Amino acid sequence: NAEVKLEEENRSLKADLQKLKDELASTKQKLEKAENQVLAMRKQSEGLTKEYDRLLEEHAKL
Amino acid sequence: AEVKLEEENRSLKADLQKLKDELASTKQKLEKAENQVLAMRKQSEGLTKEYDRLLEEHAKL
């Protein structure tokens, strides 16, 4: 029984391992998406700031 | 044959712990990232509002 019990437990733990791996994969993709969004918004912030600057430049030339 | 199964059992438990922790970390980082996204959206809105006000001021000639 020692060995059959160990088999039961091993299969169970392997299943748990797979479940956790799935969770980690999902969460990882979510994190990747959020990070990439952050970068995107850095670029966009830079651009928008540049346009705000264009306001001042153009006005300085009237 | 038993010692092998014991070995594997412990190995699997260790892997479990590692994954619990890695998942916890990843969730923390996801939370941080989403707060960053939110904050930056708000900064952007503030900036477009600033833009509107400034342009409206310039258009007053």
Author numbering:
A (entry chain A): 172 to 233
B (entry chain D): 173 to 233
Question: What do the study authors state?
Answer:
BAP29 and BAP31 are two homologous membrane proteins (∼50% sequence identity in humans) that reside in the endoplasmic reticulum (ER). They both consist of an N-terminal membrane-bound domain with three predicted transmembrane helices, and a C-terminal cytoplasmic region, which encompass ∼50% of the protein and is predicted to form a coiled coil, or more likely two coiled coils. BAP31 controls the fates of its bound clients, which may be either retained in the ER, progress through the secretory pathway or be extruded and subjected to ER-associated degradation. The structures presented here now show for the first time that the vDED domain adopts a dimeric coiled coil fold with no structural similarity to DED domains.
The structure of the vDED domain of BAP31 was determined in two different crystal forms; P21 at pH 8.0 and twinned P3221 at pH 4.2. The vDED domain forms an uninterrupted parallel coiled coil dimer in both structures. Almost all residues could be modeled in the P21 form (172–233), but not in the P3221 form (169–220). Apart from that, the two structures are however quite similar and exhibit a RMSD Cα value of 1.12 Å for 94 aligned residues. In the P21 form of BAP31 vDED, residues 204–233 of two dimers interact to form a tail-to-tail four-helical bundle across a crystal contact. This dimer-dimer interface covers an area of 2900 Å2 and is predicted by the PISA server to be stable in solution. For comparison, the radii of gyration (related to and numerically similar to the Stoke’s radius) of the dimer and potential tetramer of BAP31 vDED were estimated to be 29 and 39 Å respectively based on the P21 structure. We therefore conclude that BAP31 vDED elute as a dimer on the gel filtration column at pH 7.0. We therefore conclude that the observed tetramerization interface is unlikely to be physiologically relevant.
